[PDB]
Design a protein around this ligand. Structure first.
Ligand SMILES: CC(C)(COP(=O)(O)OP(=O)(O)OC[C@H]1O[C@@H](n2cnc3c(N)ncnc32)[C@H](O)[C@@H]1OP(=O)(O)O)[C@@H](O)C(=O)NCCC(=O)NCCS
Ligand SMILES: CC(C)(COP(=O)(O)OP(=O)(O)OC[C@H]1O[C@@H](n2cnc3c(N)ncnc32)[C@H](O)[C@@H]1OP(=O)(O)O)[C@@H](O)C(=O)NCCC(=O)NCCS
Lengths: 366, 374
């Protein structure tokens, strides 16, 4: 028999065996964590793959419960009558390859019984697509109706569409470019440098030592969070106001500073530094044109119907990038402009508008 | 009492004594380092104050040498017939209060004989103006024809205009806003956090230990440098290209990564981390409206003729902030746009465009000084 799907909402661990990675390294004994919502159709033809971003996991939707400290990262997107209507669709999400919430990553044990750490291979977005395709195949699923994702999830979705157009009926590519830009690599590589600068990094082999480079990751996340915001919205929310009763003139904090310190600590309580490094390097690797004659050739090659969404105020994946995708993907009918003040984080915060784009995508999937 | 100006181009150390700071802390025995180009007129009416930005110093113009690692940060701006025409003007630049290039800052010795370090007071942009005014007063200078500056130097210029309008004829305020924004405080406070996270910070008292938080300041500087760039120009320049023959798919560097590493190292060879912290916190403190009924009231009642410059691609001080300054300052005729792909760093790179804004500011100041009697 195939590997059974987990019960609705529960985590299933799908063992896919060795994975030959794009750089030629063979990564042995890979496990991919899966969650799903909705029944799989008798014909197995109704799967909607939900692809999480840098710090997301398989927990797309649902409340904080046992195993899940917080609500789903796209809470409400999948369910009865929801944008992914689970009365008709089977929503499946993995924890990405390199992750820390059930899938093989740097904190996982290597063959030698020690955490991978510094021995974890450099993975690409294409390696993440291969791990997900292999997990689905083990569950008896060889094609999907659609792929949906924003940010790193949009890079995963775009590689899935360009690499395997015969095995996807439609896609949502939201708030990403065709390749990593210089600014993205610059902030990603410097975020990684902040983690590696922390003396508790221990060369990436901190797993199990009782010390971890959480301080360097909090620094990385504070800078990333600024890239995720709309500049004007951030100033309208916080301006130069002090935090509560503190006096910045005598060494107290500003409200925006306190908010960033809080965002850092929240990530430190739920996310592994080594995964942050591996997935940041996979984002820097992103390039749908590699080995295919460049981005224009690779996008023009892809005939799949695609909804391309970009956020007007996005500072990290500026809308010029989504205009490029919309112009070159022949299955794209035009750029869907998400006119939002909330920056790149609009892909998480604008649930109503992102849900509209998901409904359009699932119409194209038929 | 009156101290002489240094010889042209050379450093002068002006001792101004105690300075009462905005937060009420007294900073004893302050020294301000000064460089000048051009003669001081007998009537002392021809002074152009050049106000440096975060990592700048008093070396506005001229070559590397006589203790300067590199050419002036605005090399070419001052000279015969140049945008600051030293045949007519006396261009004076200080090293800012809190600096590490001759002025009193965290690396300087406190009265107890140990570096200020963690004991260095929190200073504001207004403290920086007050120190520079005191350095001028010690040199016998009470009136300035013009203040000119970009970035932190624009914050200094704008506070000078608003605080001392009767003692400035005109100003150039380039690539800054009326107050620090949430984004600027976010990146400045996080840069400071990257320095304080470095175990060699030693609470700020690393000076003279033989250890320094250069690694954390390099991280800070790499993030700052991205804020200073034009996004499109950075992608056209480097894209996702690898550095030389390195292979990023097996752990090598990208070109933009190598470039950022290089920029951080260059700062670590010339600049003090404690100074980076003190001056970044001074930028976060910028607010021309504080104690003045807010930014709109403060700028509306400032009568000084002002040229406001903003750079189209600036991601750190976006052009909406200079549109705001140009609308509110009654002496501003309209925003002067610097059409540049180089982001915030345009204030340093676009020498011809910035030079034209300086020359216009000083043609304005010369007309006004002819009609100013003191
Ligand atoms: C919550 C979210 C959906 C957007 O909201 P937000 O911008 O965080 O705004 P909120 O005001 O709700 O702030 C959330 C928290 O900030 C806290 N907060 C607000 N102002 C604060 C201040 N001045 N100081 C400290 N904490 C503050 C609130 O207490 C709240 O706490 P909680 O989340 O634990 O309940 C956020 O998760 C998001 O969109 N960004 C995350 C990006 C991400 O996860 N990336 C990884 C993959 S990209
Ligand atoms: C003045 C300034 C803005 C000029 O910028 P610019 O003329 O556009 O120059 P760039 O930003 O392209 O820098 C070129 C340098 O990068 C180096 N470089 C370029 N590509 C590189 C790469 N892939 N790897 C490594 N180094 C690289 C060059 O070798 C050159 O080095 P050099 O300056 O020692 O000769 C720049 O010197 C600078 O950023 N420093 C001033 C200080 C500052 O921005 N802030 C302080 C107060 S705001």
């Amino acid at each position: 028999a195939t590997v059974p799907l987990p019960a609705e909402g529960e985590i299933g661990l799908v063992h896919i065996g060795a994975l030959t990675l794009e750089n030629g390294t063979v990564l042995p004994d890979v496990t991919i964590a899966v969650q799903r919502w909705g029944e799989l159709a008798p014909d197995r033809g109704n799967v909607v793959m939900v692809l999480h971003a840098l710090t997301g996991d398989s927990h797309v939707t649902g409340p904080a419960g046992d195993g899940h400290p917080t609500a789903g990262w796209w809470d409400g997107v999948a369910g009865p009558g929801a944008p992914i209507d689970t009365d008709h669709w089977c929503a499946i999400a993995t924890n990405v390859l390199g992750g820390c919430r059930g899938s093989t990553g740097p904190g996982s044990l290597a063959p030698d019984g020690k955490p991978w750490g510094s021995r974890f291979p450099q993975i690409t977005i294409r390696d993440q697509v291969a791990a997900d395709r292999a997990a689905l195949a083990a569950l008896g699923i060889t094609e999907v109706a659609a792929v949906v994702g924003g940010s790193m999830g949009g890079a995963r979705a775009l590689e899935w569409l360009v690499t395997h157009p015969d095995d996807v009926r439609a896609g949502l590519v939201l708030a990403v470019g065709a390749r990593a830009t210089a600014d993205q690599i610059g902030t990603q590589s410097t975020q990684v440098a902040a983690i590696k600068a922390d003396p508790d990094w221990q060369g990436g082999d901190y797993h199990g030592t009782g010390r971890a480079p959480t301080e360097g990751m909090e620094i990385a996340r504070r800078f990333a969070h600024l890239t995720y915001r709309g500049e004007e919205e951030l100033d309208d929310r916080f301006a130069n106001t002090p935090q509560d009763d503190e006096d910045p003139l005598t060494g107290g904090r500003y409200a925006v500073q306190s908010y960033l310190e809080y965002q850092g600590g929240k990530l430190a309580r739920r996310f592994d530094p080594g995964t942050y490094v591996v997935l940041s390097d996979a984002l820097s690797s992103h390039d749908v044109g590699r080995g295919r004659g460049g981005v224009e050739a690779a996008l023009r090659s892809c005939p799949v119907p695609v909804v391309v969404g970009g956020i007007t105020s996005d500072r990290l994946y500026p809308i010029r990038l989504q205009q490029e995708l919309a112009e070159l993907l022949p299955g794209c009918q035009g750029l869907d402009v998400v006119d939002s003040i909330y920056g790149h984080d609009g892909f998480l915060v604008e649930t109503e508008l992102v849900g509209k784009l998901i409904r359009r995508t699932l119409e194209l999937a038929q």
